[PDB]
């Protein structure tokens, strides 16, 4: 009697390296513990006082950021329930662009409180019922917590004040500069129609100087050089070709069949005369700049130099398309001269040297266009990548405001008001659902708690102050990070605001992820290949 044998049935028929977990203890509680560990890995990065992390992935690439979704991507999350919470966070990133850390924090909190409720004696079904009804109540409530609205997205000061909050959590020290830049870019590329595309905001990261030397450019920048002798143009007449800058050849095998010394003597001169004719037709359309998506031939380059045309070679097709959008041109698959409509224009096209890097700039002078570039300067590539992520946050906030212009107070004010109202709803709801409603409410407290802990103050006093002020009636009051002691202030009057849609989607996705993790009861992992 010195060995316990596998029980007859599934335990014996299970494969060698496979695992099977069943029940509250082996499955539910272990999943909740994993999600809790995940939320703890990302909690200290939440908010303006949130700290950065230096993640090294399996490829030894370095990420310095406090962006939750980035940290999650670069982590090797292997527990399946944590993977599910990460999927929720990435869905938040896809739908909204900001709020991934809210999703993580809130999901982890809901799951911890769900474990506590299961221990006190509620069933996963009742916990899920209460969580769903409380998420419905939160969605019913949030529209009433909306405090302000944008009222204009063509301005540059209002848009900066609106994007500052989203670009403050990331890059707290320097946020007025970044909000100015991102507002300039967003309103440059904002068309008279209410549709806004975030891929039309381009970001060029050039080593050298620092974040305060960054700038916006109404146009495009390419870390390229020019193929020919011309480097500058002041009234660009750009002609864009998706084809190479070479003589067209057959898609079927072509052979030069010579049968006479005369044909042999004349073939090459005929080729160059053909090239000269092609490029001269292009130059005579007025084009002073040619942009080819393919290669450039030496003879064609020769004749472009002869006829004073700036030649640019863009390897990428997305780059070619975006340049076409920028200049108002059409990519021609043939080397035929462009018509007056197929041509593009720029107030200037020139080659410059930003730092060590050489760049070709298609710059409009007008304060508008279809594409704008943000040239990010910085002393470190990692710093510039973090600032690019902050730019992405600001741009996605602008898009969220184009979709829904409503705003809720930040710094935990909406979360505290939600917690209060949902607690008041659970106190009226009879039956075992009230426990889960009240825990769903208490989960919101995790947001101001995380903000306070990262601010460097006592979260319990901060939360007590917030509850007291929201009981006295102020729904726009949240915590003040610019205070060494626990403090609170008017989030609206301070200008710290979140997006109604951001909160909506974050709450929905976090609740759905928690509820799925709870709905799991048995786990049958396979042998890790």
């Amino acid at each position: 009697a010195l060995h316990v044998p596998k029980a007859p049935g599934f335990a014996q028929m299970l494969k060698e390296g496979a695992k099977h977990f069943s029940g509250l203890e082996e499955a539910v509680y272990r999943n909740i513990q994993a999600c809790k560990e995940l939320a703890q890995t990302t909690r200290t990065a939440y908010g303006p006082n949130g700290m950065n992390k230096m993640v090294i992935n399996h490829l030894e690439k370095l990420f310095v950021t406090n962006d939750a979704a980035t940290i999650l991507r670069e982590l090797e999350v292997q527990h399946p329930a944590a993977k599910m919470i990460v999927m929720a966070s990435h869905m938040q990133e896809q739908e909204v662009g900001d709020g991934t850390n809210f999703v993580l924090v809130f999901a982890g909190a809901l799951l911890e409180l769900a474990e506590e409720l299961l221990r006190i004696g509620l069933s996963v079904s009742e916990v899920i019922e209460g969580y769903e009804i409380a998420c419905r109540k939160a969605h019913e409530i949030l529209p009433n917590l909306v405090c302000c609205s944008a009222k204009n997205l063509r301005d540059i000061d209002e848009v900066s004040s609106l994007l500052r909050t989203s670009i403050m959590s990331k890059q707290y020290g320097n946020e007025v500069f970044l909000a100015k830049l991102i507002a300039q870019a967003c309103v440059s590329i904002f068309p008279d129609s209410g549709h806004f595309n975030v891929d039309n905001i381009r970001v060029c990261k050039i080593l050298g100087s620092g974040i305060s030397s960054s700038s916006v450019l109404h146009g495009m920048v390419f870390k390229k050089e020019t193929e020919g002798d011309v480097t500058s143009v002041k009234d660009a007449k750009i002609a864009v070709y998706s084809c190479p800058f070479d003589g067209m050849i057959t898609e079927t095998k072509g052979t030069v069949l010579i049968k006479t010394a005369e044909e042999l003597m004349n073939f090459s001169k005929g080729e160059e005369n053909l090239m000269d004719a092609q490029v001269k037709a292009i130059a005579d359309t007025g084009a002073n700049v040619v942009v080819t998506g393919g290669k450039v031939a030496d003879m064609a380059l020769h004749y472009a130099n002869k006829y004073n045309i700036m030649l640019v070679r863009l390897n990428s097709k997305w780059d070619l398309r975006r340049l076409c959008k920028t200049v108002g041109a059409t990519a021609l698959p043939r080397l035929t001269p462009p018509v007056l409509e197929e041509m593009g224009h720029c107030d200037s096209v020139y080659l410059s040297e930003v730092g060590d890097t050489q760049v070709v700039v298609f710059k409009h002078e007008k304060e508008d266009g279809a594409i704008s570039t943000i040239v990010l300067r910085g002393s470190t590539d990692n710093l510039m990548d973090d600032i690019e992520r902050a730019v992405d946050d600001g741009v996605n906030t602008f898009k969220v405001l184009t979709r829904d212009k409503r705003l809720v107070p930040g710094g935990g004010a909406t979360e505290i008001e939600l917690a209060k109202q949902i607690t008041s709803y659970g106190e009226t709801c009879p039956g075992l659902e009230q426990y889960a409603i009240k825990k769903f409410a208490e989960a919101f407290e995790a947001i101001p708690r995380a903000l306070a802990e990262n601010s460097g103050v006592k979260a319990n006093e901060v939360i007590s102050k917030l509850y007291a002020v929201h009981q006295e009636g102020n729904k726009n009051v949240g915590l003040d990070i610019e205070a060494e002691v626990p403090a609170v202030k008017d989030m609206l009057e301070a200008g710290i605001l979140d997006t109604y849609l951001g909160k909506y989607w974050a709450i929905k996705l976090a609740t759905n992820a928690a509820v799925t993790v709870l709905r799991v009861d048995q786990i049958i992992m396979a042998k890790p290949a």
Binding site: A1, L2, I120, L432, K458
Partner: protein
């Protein structure tokens, strides 16, 4: 390599260490959480010696399992502590300590300092002690019925519950006989003088406590009697053989008659020892050392029955039972050292073995509990349960105060602490109230192991305990309903529950103070 500490020295620190300790402790708790109450289920543990332990006893389980986490080590140690001190509550203590650490995890995650939590816990422990002593009730230890109910309320949670009356009477008789006073010092030594001998076979219903002792021994010579109805008994620590001297007593023979004279001198020495014994006219002689065949001859000539090599513990029990005094020099033997008081010496065959009974004693201050049953494992569990029963009887006879069971005491104390917390205005009110609600785990676990609805029942019970004279209300671990303990009869010893609460709170305090684990370093 230029290290400062040796490799293999790994140092963890901080909230990871705190949460790790708390999780290890609460894991030890989840191991035996279901072994508490009357409706518990057995666990079959496999020893490294090919043995088996089928039990419900928290300390048995935790002592048979092995761990490497130092927090789990500490929890197993406190289970051992509870078992050695009171001999009951070995799983109540584990569960309470786990719940206390669980509720402290909250405050530790919320930036509260472990010393603040610990000071609150100590306040709460003092107030728990106060509340238990206020709600306790006295006992008339002369009331055998009250004592039997006390012992039943302690063994109902164990396998012997089917033979409750038998086991209760056995434990009560054993402890009441082991109760001994000499020179103004009362002594209930149920470890040296209440002996459990497990003889597999037979039936448990024939198990009994003897008015005497029993050993696994036979007569040295089959001509000796095996049945004597008023034996005068002599006990010896010395060999009735002829052994050598402590010095280099080497002899030197040159004469012929000297060899024979020396061997005859040895024989005469044995004769003189045996005559020093016969002069007291005993019927039985019991030795811890050997008895030579010539000594057997002389004793048989005197019509004496001898038992050769008994253990010192068995001899001490025979002393206490028959009223004898162990001697080591038959020359120094006195009538006061002879054992009168045994009413019958019998040596009977139980199965294919010979067992010596010295029963029918009058005023025996020692006893042997003869356990019979299906197997060594069943009898090991019966013996452990009887240890529980006897230790509870002892704790009561020492401190006759009782407290109500079924979680009634836990709920009364939790309510009293919550009521006292409303005057608390500092930051310790929260951990204080938290340990108060952490005492509720005992009725929670009872309801869980009975198979009823914890939420509903615990809510009704917490509400009942807000009324005035409801500190006796608890739950049945057998039906899943709230009852008055005054009507059910489950009353625990105040000493047991005090030791439980104290051990739990101090274990929590220790693991909270702990941080910064270090390891590897070799003594």
């Amino acid at each position: 390599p230029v290290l400062v500490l040796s490799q293999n020295t790994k140092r963890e620190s901080g909230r990871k260490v705190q949460s790790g300790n708390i999780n290890a402790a609460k894991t030890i708790a989840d191991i035996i959480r279901t072994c508490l109450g009357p409706k518990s289920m057995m666990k079959m543990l496999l020893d490294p010696m090919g043995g088996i332990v089928m039990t419900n006893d928290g300390n048995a389980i935790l002592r048979e399992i092995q761990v490497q986490h130092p927090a789990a080590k500490s929890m197993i140690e406190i289970s051992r502590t509870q078992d050695e001190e009171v001999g009951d509550g070995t799983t109540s203590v584990i569960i309470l300590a786990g719940e206390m650490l669980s509720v402290a995890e909250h405050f530790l995650e919320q930036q509260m300092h472990p010393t603040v939590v610990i000071s609150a816990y100590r306040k709460a422990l003092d107030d728990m002690i106060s509340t238990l002593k206020k709600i306790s009730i006295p006992v008339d230890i002369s009331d055998s019925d009250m004592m039997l109910n006390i012992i039943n309320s302690s063994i109902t949670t164990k396998a012997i519950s089917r033979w409750s009356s038998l086991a209760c009477n056995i434990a009560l008789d054993a402890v009441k006989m082991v109760q001994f006073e000499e020179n103004g010092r009362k002594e209930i030594d149920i470890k040296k003088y209440a002996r459990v001998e497990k003889i597999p076979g037979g039936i448990i219903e024939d198990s009994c406590v003897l008015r005497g002792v029993m050993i696994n021994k036979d007569v040295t010579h089959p001509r000796m009697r095996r049945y004597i109805k008023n034996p005068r008994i002599v006990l010896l620590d010395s060999s009735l053989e002829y052994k050598k001297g402590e010095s280099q007593t080497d002899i030197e023979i040159t004469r012929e008659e000297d060899f024979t004279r020396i061997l005859q001198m040895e024989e005469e020495y044995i004769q003189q020892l045996c005559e020093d014994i016969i002069q007291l006219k005993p019927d039985v002689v019991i030795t811890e050392k050997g008895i030579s065949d010539l000594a057997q001859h002389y004793l048989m000539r005197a019509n004496i029955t001898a038992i050769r090599r008994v253990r010192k513990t068995d001899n001490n029990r025979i002393a206490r039972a028959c009223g004898a005094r162990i001697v080591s020099r038959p020359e120094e033997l006195r009538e006061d050292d002879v054992g009168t008081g045994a009413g019958l010496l019998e040596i009977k065959k139980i199965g294919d073995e010979y067992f010596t009974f010295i029963t029918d004693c009058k005023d025996p201050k020692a006893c042997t509990i003869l356990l019979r049953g299906a197997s060594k494992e069943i009898l090991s569990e019966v013996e452990r349960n009887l240890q529980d029963a006897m230790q509870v009887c002892r704790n009561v006879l020492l401190d006759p105060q009782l407290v109500p069971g079924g979680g009634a005491s836990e709920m009364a104390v939790a309510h009293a602490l919550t009521e006292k917390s409303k005057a608390m205005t500092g930051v310790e009110q929260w951990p204080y109230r938290a340990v108060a609600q952490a005492l509720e785990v005992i009725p929670r676990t009872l309801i869980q192991n009975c198979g009823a609805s914890t939420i509903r029942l615990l809510t009704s019970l917490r509400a009942k305990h807000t009324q005035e004279n409801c500190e006796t209300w608890g739950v049945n671990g057998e039906t899943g309903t709230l009852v008055d303990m005054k009507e059910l009869g489950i009353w625990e010893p105040l000493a047991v529950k005090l030791q439980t609460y104290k051990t739990a709170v101090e274990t929590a305090v220790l693991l909270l103070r702990i941080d910064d684990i270090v390891s590897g370093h070799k003594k």
